[PDB]
């Protein structure tokens, strides 16, 4: 529940929240069965996926050690089977 700013415009949702110095701006789209550009390469973005994904992994590991917490958090099945969301 530490956040600062919210922006929205024609492209999705820009959430902005800070951690201890370095400060976060990021994005979520508006969900549709909207197709892929069918050109641009994933491979570059797939390895951005490998490394950056790992970053995210430990960052949330060492990040659940902030207080003390079980990394990654357990989920209840009914949650996802029904909701499948941040709930």
């Amino acid at each position: 529940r530490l956040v600062r700013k919210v922006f929205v415009s024609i492209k999705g949702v820009y959430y902005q929240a800070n951690i201890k110095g370095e400060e976060v701006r990021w994005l979520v789209p508006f969900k549709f069965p909207e197709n892929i550009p069918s050109d641009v390469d994933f491979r570059i973005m797939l390895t951005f996926l490998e490394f950056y994904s790992t970053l995210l992994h430990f960052v949330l590991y060492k990040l659940y050690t902030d207080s003390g917490l079980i990394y990654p958090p357990k989920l209840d099945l009914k949650k996802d089977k029904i909701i499948s969301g941040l709930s």
Binding site: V3, R4, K5, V6, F7, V8, S9, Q16
Partner: peptide, 27 residues
């Protein structure tokens, strides 16, 4: 805009369908 201030804007600018602040970007 609830968090663009921290005010909890009253329902006068709200309570649809009356106009709401159009966007008011953080920047």
């Amino acid at each position: 805009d609830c968090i663009n201030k921290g005010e909890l804007v009253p329902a006068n600018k709200y309570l649809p369908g009356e106009a709401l602040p159009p966007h008011l970007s953080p920047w």
